[PDB]
Amino acid sequence: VLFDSYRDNVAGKSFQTRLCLPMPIDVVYTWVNGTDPKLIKEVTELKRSNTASRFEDNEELRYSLRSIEKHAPWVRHIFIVTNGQIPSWLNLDNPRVSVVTHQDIFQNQTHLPTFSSPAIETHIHRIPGLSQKFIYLNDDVMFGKDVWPDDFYSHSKGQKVYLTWPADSLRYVNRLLNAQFGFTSRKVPAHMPHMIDRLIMQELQDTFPQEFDKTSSHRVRHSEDMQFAFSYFYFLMSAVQQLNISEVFDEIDTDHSGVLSDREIRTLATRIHELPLSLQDLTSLEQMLINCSKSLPSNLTHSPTQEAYYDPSMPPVTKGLVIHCKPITERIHKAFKDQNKYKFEIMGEEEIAFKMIRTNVSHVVGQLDDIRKNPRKFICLNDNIDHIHKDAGTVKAVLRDFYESMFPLPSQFELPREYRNRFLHMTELQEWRIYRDKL
Amino acid sequence: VLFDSYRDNVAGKSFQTRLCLPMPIDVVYTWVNGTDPKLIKEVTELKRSKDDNTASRFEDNEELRYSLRSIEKHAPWVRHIFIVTNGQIPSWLNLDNPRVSVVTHQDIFQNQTHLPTFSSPAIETHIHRIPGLSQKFIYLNDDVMFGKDVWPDDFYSHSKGQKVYLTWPADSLRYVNRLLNAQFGFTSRKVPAHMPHMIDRLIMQELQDTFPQEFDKTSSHRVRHSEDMQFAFSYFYFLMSAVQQLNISEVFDEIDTDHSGVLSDREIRTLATRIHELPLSLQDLTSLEQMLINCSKSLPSNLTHTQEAYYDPSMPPVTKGLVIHCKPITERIHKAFKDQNKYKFEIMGEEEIAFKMIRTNVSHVVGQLDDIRKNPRKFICLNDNIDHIHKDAGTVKAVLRDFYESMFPLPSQFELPRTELQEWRIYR
Numbered sequence: 001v002l003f004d005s006y007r008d009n010v011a012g013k014s015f016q017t018r019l020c021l022p023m024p025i026d027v028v029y030t031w032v033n034g035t036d037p038k039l040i041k042e043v044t045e046l047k048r049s050n051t052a053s054r055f056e057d058n059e060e061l062r063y064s065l066r067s068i069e070k071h072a073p074w075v076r077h078i079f080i081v082t083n084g085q086i087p088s089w090l091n092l093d094n095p096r097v098s099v100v101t102h103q104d105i106f107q108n109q110t111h112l113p114t115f116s117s118p119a120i121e122t123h124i125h126r127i128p129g130l131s132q133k134f135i136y137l138n139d140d141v142m143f144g145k146d147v148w149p150d151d152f153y154s155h156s157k158g159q160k161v162y163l164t165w166p167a168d169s170l171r172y173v174n175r176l177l178n179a180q181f182g183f184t185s186r187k188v189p190a191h192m193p194h195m196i197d198r199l200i201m202q203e204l205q206d207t208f209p210q211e212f213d214k215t216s217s218h219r220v221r222h223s224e225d226m227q228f229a230f231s232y233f234y235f236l237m238s239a240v241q242q243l244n245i246s247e248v249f250d251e252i253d254t255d256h257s258g259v260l261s262d263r264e265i266r267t268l269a270t271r272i273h274e275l276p277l278s279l280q281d282l283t284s285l286e287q288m289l290i291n292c293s294k295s296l297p298s299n300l301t302h303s304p305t306q307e308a309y310y311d312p313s314m315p316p317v318t319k320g321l322v323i324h325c326k327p328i329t330e331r332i333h334k335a336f337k338d339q340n341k342y343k344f345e346i347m348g349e350e351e352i353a354f355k356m357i358r359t360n361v362s363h364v365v366g367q368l369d370d371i372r373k374n375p376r377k378f379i380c381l382n383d384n385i386d387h388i389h390k391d392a393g394t395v396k397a398v399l400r401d402f403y404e405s406m407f408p409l410p411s412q413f414e415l416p417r418e419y420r421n422r423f424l425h426m427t428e429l430q431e432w433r434i435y436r437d438k439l
Numbered sequence: 440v441l442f443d444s445y446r447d448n449v450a451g452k453s454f455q456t457r458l459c460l461p462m463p464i465d466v467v468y469t470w471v472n473g474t475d476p477k478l479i480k481e482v483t484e485l486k487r488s489k490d491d492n493t494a495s496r497f498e499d500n501e502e503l504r505y506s507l508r509s510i511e512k513h514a515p516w517v518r519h520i521f522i523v524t525n526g527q528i529p530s531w532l533n534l535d536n537p538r539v540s541v542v543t544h545q546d547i548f549q550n551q552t553h554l555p556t557f558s559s560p561a562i563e564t565h566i567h568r569i570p571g572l573s574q575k576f577i578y579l580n581d582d583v584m585f586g587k588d589v590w591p592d593d594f595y596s597h598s599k600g601q602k603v604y605l606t607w608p609a610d611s612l613r614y615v616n617r618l619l620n621a622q623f624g625f626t627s628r629k630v631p632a633h634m635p636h637m638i639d640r641l642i643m644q645e646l647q648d649t650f651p652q653e654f655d656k657t658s659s660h661r662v663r664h665s666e667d668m669q670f671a672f673s674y675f676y677f678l679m680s681a682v683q684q685l686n687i688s689e690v691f692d693e694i695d696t697d698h699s700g701v702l703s704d705r706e707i708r709t710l711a712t713r714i715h716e717l718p719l720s721l722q723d724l725t726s727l728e729q730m731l732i733n734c735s736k737s738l739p740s741n742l743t744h745t746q747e748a749y750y751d752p753s754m755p756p757v758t759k760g761l762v763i764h765c766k767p768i769t770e771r772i773h774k775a776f777k778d779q780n781k782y783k784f785e786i787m788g789e790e791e792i793a794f795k796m797i798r799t800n801v802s803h804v805v806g807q808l809d810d811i812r813k814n815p816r817k818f819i820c821l822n823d824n825i826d827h828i829h830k831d832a833g834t835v836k837a838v839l840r841d842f843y844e845s846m847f848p849l850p851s852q853f854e855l856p857r858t859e860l861q862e863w864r865i866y867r
């Protein structure tokens with residue numbers, strides 16, 4: 001049915017890969033339980049040699065998974081990157097979710113245990129089995145309306161880039177980018193889910209290998225870290241492809257004969273000269289070709305078909321002749337310059353709802369009611385709460401109420417409420433499984 | 440395999456129809472051959488019994504031949520090509536190729552008394568009736584072609600609907616503009632680009648059921664008329680103007696996030712923010728509650744229909760029936776979301792359209808086509824404004840052919856198997 005249907009066109013050839021969005025698409029999370037005693041002691045020793053808001057969990061991951069089930073049902077697999085911690089409610093019997101530890105993705109184990117989200121984020125593209133294009137969600141980011149892959153990518157325009165107006169980390173990265181790509185004024189990607197291409201990310205990190213190693217080596221956040229989204233999206237937007245002159249030729253050689261006719265030459269002429277095209281512009285190009293055929297070796301200039309030229313001195317204008325004629329290829333490189341290696345589409349921030357949650361209750365109710373009234377595709381409720389403040393518990397309740405109003409149905413990734421995982425850490429679970437199944 | 444791949448997701452359900460562009464997509468051309476001596480005689484007689492319909496209306500300058508070559512090169516995903524004519528067939532058309540067919544005016548016109556016709560607007564009122572035509576099809580005038588690779592997303596996306604290519608700005612439009620202003624309210628409108636037009640057959644019929652008199656009148660004009668429903672202008676402004684009323688039942692379902700059929704206090708609050716300006720006052724919430732309470736006592740028990748535990752013990756189970764038939768609530772919902780667009784659409788610029796009016800000054804035509812040579816465009820229209828009696832008209836036709844051959848020199852699957860002094864003056 002569908003195999004035949006996609007070949008049912010004048011070309012008799014399938015274009016499904018261009019007519020359909022790229023699949024599969026996995027999701028990657030990072031999650032941490034700040035209440036874990038092993039973490040608190042290990043963090044304590046490190047500092048002895050980062051407030052509770054960085055590691056605190058308001059059940060954000062639980063409800064974000066509910067939002068995927070409701071608003072992104074097309075996701076293939078969900079990877080939850082942790083330091084070894086396991087959420088008590090996570091249903092590990094569901095093959096659609098798995099836990100990935102820092103040990104599994106970090107390259108230098110000396111960087112662990114870590115407590116720096118930038119360091120972790122340098123390695124999440126290394127997850128074995130990860131789809132080439134995946135979407136990274138912070139645990140406190142979730143979907144507020146139905147989303148589809150074209151909210152992140154299209155074949156015609158590439159990845160969407162959601163930029164916003166603005167950090168010492170940006171100065172450091174801006175300096176790197178200025179030196180690599182020249183200067184540009186750079187806005188900041190929104191606090192939202194980010195689609196990442198594993199190959200582009202690796203190409204980026206191969207460009208700045210020492211910097212990403214440095215960022216990974218920082219066990220706490222640091223001013224000279226490679227900002228995950230900022231680094232990726234500006235590498236994607238700034239990577240340059242060098243003009244392929246042989247491909248310029250094949251475009252002009254519309255009968256695929258290997259030789260440029262007079263009418264094909266005119267098109268080349270119009271593309272290295274300002275319009276209107278003068279007779280001097282045209283004859284100059286012709287003279288360049290004739291001078292080049294004489295000067296160049298006959299081996300490089302290389303009759304299946306017979307081309308007749310207005311100028312009886314014009315030799316067969318072959319690809320070889322054009323490739324190695326510097327006067328022409330210079331004007332070509334001058335007339336077309338700086339081709340982006342990747343396509344991308346700048347987006348506004350209309351579909352992002354980013355809220356800094358503090359402890360002023362009246363204000364928090366107002367922020368969440370704005371999302372109730374005005375649904376948004378991308379929601380980020382960032383923790384800036386002060387728990388010592390008396391109104392802290394009230395705020396936490398208002399948040400739970402908002403979350404429950406949007407996503408009241410438990411997901412296939414939640415254990416039943418009466419059950420919980422026996423072990424809080426992956427190493428303990430690995431040991432129990434081996435003891436049980438032992439002979 | 441691929442079948443297995445589209446269910447490989449957390450829902451275990453296939454979303455192929457949303458993840459893939461809509462297919463199939465056919466192409467429709469109209470074509471006329473003005474050199475046909477029977478056509479010439481008939482047109483002359485029609486004019487006399489009644490200028491504005493010169494040879495430029497009907498002259499084949501090889502446009503169709505080269506446009507078909509541009510489909511083979513730039514739109515290989517098209518399923519079928521229908522060529523609509525008055526019975527004429529290009530001598531070179533390979534009808535043994537099942538990917539192309541000829542459709543006559545007789546096959547699609549409703550009133551046969553309107554034929555024979557010589558009016559493109561009249562013909563265009565019926566091309567959506569082609570038997571077997573894909574629901575979404577792309578209509579090309581013969582003098583329109585593709586100049587770069589195009590894909591269906593150049594015309595339509597699931598997320599944003601049909602693309603509408605508008606240009607800063609005729610008597611025909613004044614007539615349609617008045618009709619639209621009366622139907623939808625007054626607005627100043629821009630004109631769609633001269634380009635291939637994607638048309639949805641169901642929306643076209645809905646449009647023609649909204650102005651049945653005017654489309655029958657357009658169909659009945661055997662030559663172009665000041666009071667024609669201009670094809671693209673009528674279609675795209677109907678698409679952008681049709682309004683739909685909000686479906687309260689669907690609002691309720693979005694609010695009822697646990698799908699329990701009853702609105703909890705938590706879900707009611709969301710409803711309250713949607714019909715009120717923030718910040719939300721206690722009075723806003725209580726008044727909404729009182730409307731439901733007032734509505735429950737008043738509505739028939741048959742309409743009102745784990746039990747819900749409400750803050751106010753007086754609250755009834757807020758069922759869909761209670762909300763839908765509560766006039767004070769439904770009217771306040773409609774006041775808060777009024778005149779929703781019935782169709783999705785995306786406004787586009789004219790960066791990808793190259794529209795050239797071809798006259799009889801050879802050097803100026805060369806300049807116009809050089810701009811396309813240098814600056815490729817997805818959509819090209821070379822419009823006939825040639826004085827075909829002029830001596831230089833033959834030279835201009837040769838300039839066009841030379842330009843056409845520089846872009847598409849390869850005969851297409853739709854063509855049947857099988858100057859220097861003019862070059863000097865045009866170019867040297």
Ligand SMILES: *[C@@H]1O[C@H](CO)[C@@H](O[C@@H]2O[C@H](CO)[C@@H](O[C@@H]3O[C@H](CO[C@H]4O[C@H](CO)[C@@H](O)[C@H](O)[C@@H]4O)[C@@H](O)[C@H](O[C@H]4O[C@H](CO)[C@@H](O)[C@H](O)[C@@H]4O)[C@@H]3O)[C@H](O)[C@H]2NC(C)=O)[C@H](O)[C@H]1NC(C)=O
Pocket residue numbers: 472473474475476499528529530531
């Ligand atoms: C738009 O409309 C116009 C007008 O209706 C069409 O013009 C006709 O085009 C056809 C071609 O399809 C013409 O027919 C051809 O004429 C050529 C010249 O004929 C003269 O010389 C021959 C002797 O060689 C005499 O017999 C003849 O009477 C003329 O004095 C012929 O050389 C062609 O012959 C070839 O085609 C035939 C038919 O298939 C073969 O059998 C032959 O073996 C040979 O291969 C052919 O006869 C016709 O004269 C034109 N009519 C008019 C009134 O001008 C356009 O074709 C049409 N455009 C499109 C795109 O369809």
Ligand SMILES: *[C@@H]1O[C@H](CO)[C@@H](O[C@@H]2O[C@H](CO)[C@@H](O[C@@H]3O[C@H](CO)[C@@H](O)[C@H](O)[C@@H]3O)[C@H](O)[C@H]2NC(C)=O)[C@H](O)[C@H]1NC(C)=O
Pocket residue numbers: 033035036037086087088089422424
């Ligand atoms: C985040 O980490 C905290 C701390 O590890 C988790 O809370 C802890 O949950 C465990 C359950 O395995 C509690 O241990 C249990 O205690 C009871 C009573 O003492 C005992 O009967 C059990 O045998 C078991 O030892 C532990 O007390 C509790 N600690 C705190 C501070 O609450 C929490 O569940 C983690 N969150 C997530 C989402 O995983």
Ligand SMILES: CC(=O)N[C@H]1[C@@H](OP(=O)(O)OP(=O)(O)OC[C@H]2O[C@@H](n3ccc(=O)[nH]c3=O)[C@H](O)[C@@H]2O)O[C@H](CO)[C@@H](O)[C@@H]1O
Pocket residue numbers: 029030031032053054055081082114115116117118120121137138139140141190191192227228229380382
């Ligand atoms: C949406 C967004 O743009 N978020 C960015 C923001 O996060 P932000 O500054 O909001 O910091 P968060 O507290 O949300 O932590 C970032 C992410 O890292 C996870 N985490 C954090 C600490 C830890 O030890 N383990 C762990 O897994 C958190 O669960 C969260 O998923 O600034 C960080 C610093 O540049 C970036 O890394 C985050 O990408």
Ligand SMILES: CC(=O)N[C@H]1[C@@H](OP(=O)(O)OP(=O)(O)OC[C@H]2O[C@@H](n3ccc(=O)[nH]c3=O)[C@H](O)[C@@H]2O)O[C@H](CO)[C@@H](O)[C@@H]1O
Pocket residue numbers: 468469470471495496497523524556557558559560562563579580581582583611632633634635669670671820822823
């Ligand atoms: C690209 C575009 O927006 N074109 C519009 C423009 O075209 P325009 O004014 O340029 O009209 P054209 O002369 O190109 O004719 C339009 C189409 O009708 C065909 N034709 C014409 C006469 C005839 O007797 N038989 C026949 O089949 C021509 O082949 C051509 O395919 O204004 C016309 C008048 O509103 C509209 O109808 C055309 O849709």
Ligand SMILES: *[C@@H]1O[C@H](CO[C@@H]2O[C@@H](C)[C@@H](O)[C@@H](O)[C@@H]2O)[C@@H](O[C@@H]2O[C@H](CO)[C@@H](O)[C@H](O)[C@H]2NC(C)=O)[C@H](O)[C@H]1NC(C)=O
Pocket residue numbers: 108109110111217218
């Ligand atoms: C893997 O990392 C170790 C450790 O690097 C140091 O410790 C990190 C936590 C962080 O603070 C880094 O900036 C540190 O450099 C590397 O071994 C270190 O190598 C440097 C340079 O030779 C030396 O000065 C340190 O003393 C070394 N530290 C230790 C503990 O050996 C090691 O080279 C890294 N592996 C690779 C392949 O590069």
Ligand SMILES: *[C@@H]1O[C@H](CO[C@@H]2O[C@@H](C)[C@@H](O)[C@@H](O)[C@@H]2O)[C@@H](O[C@@H]2O[C@H](CO)[C@@H](O)[C@H](O)[C@H]2NC(C)=O)[C@H](O)[C@H]1NC(C)=O
Pocket residue numbers: 550551552553659660661
């Ligand atoms: C189909 O059309 C005929 C007549 O169309 C006429 O010719 C066209 C070219 C154009 O000039 C039209 O304006 C003409 O009307 C309809 O028959 C006409 O009906 C009206 C009112 O019933 C009458 O005033 C005319 O004299 C009639 N003309 C003729 C020639 O019969 C006919 O009703 C149409 N068919 C349908 C189903 O509506």
Ligand SMILES: *[C@@H]1O[C@H](CO[C@@H]2O[C@@H](C)[C@@H](O)[C@@H](O)[C@@H]2O)[C@@H](O)[C@H](O)[C@H]1NC(C)=O
Pocket residue numbers: 726727729730733767
């Ligand atoms: C709710 O109803 C209150 C009472 O209205 C009076 O009594 C009821 C039983 C009906 O018969 C009605 O026609 C009478 O006028 C009103 O005072 C109150 O304003 C109403 N509130 C809302 C929000 O509708």
Ligand SMILES: *[C@@H]1O[C@H](CO)[C@@H](O)[C@H](O)[C@H]1NC(C)=O
Pocket residue numbers: 244245246247250
């Ligand atoms: C340039 O394109 C040709 C195809 O026309 C390809 O064979 C060649 O490898 C390309 N060169 C580079 C450097 O990419």
Ligand SMILES: *[C@@H]1O[C@H](CO)[C@@H](O)[C@H](O)[C@H]1NC(C)=O
Pocket residue numbers: 360361362363
């Ligand atoms: C909460 O924030 C609003 C807006 O900034 C302010 O007017 C109000 O006084 C604040 N309330 C408290 C208790 O801080």
Ligand SMILES: *[C@@H]1O[C@H](CO)[C@@H](O)[C@H](O)[C@H]1NC(C)=O
Pocket residue numbers: 686687688689692
């Ligand atoms: C309103 O929505 C319901 C489903 O929620 C649907 O069954 C019904 O047909 C819709 N009504 C109209 C008039 O579209």
Ligand SMILES: *[C@@H]1O[C@H](CO)[C@@H](O)[C@H](O)[C@H]1NC(C)=O
Pocket residue numbers: 800801802803
């Ligand atoms: C064509 O137009 C140019 C103006 O650009 C003019 O100089 C020239 O004389 C015109 N040629 C004819 C034949 O009218």
Ligand SMILES: [Ca+2]
Pocket residue numbers: 253254255256257258259260261264
């Ligand atoms: Ca060639």
Ligand SMILES: [Ca+2]
Pocket residue numbers: 695696697698699700701702703706
């Ligand atoms: Ca409910």
Ligand SMILES: [Mg+2]
Pocket residue numbers: 053054055056057140383
């Ligand atoms: Mg947090």
Ligand SMILES: [Mg+2]
Pocket residue numbers: 138140382383
């Ligand atoms: Mg955060």
Ligand SMILES: [Mg+2]
Pocket residue numbers: 495496497498499582823
């Ligand atoms: Mg024409």
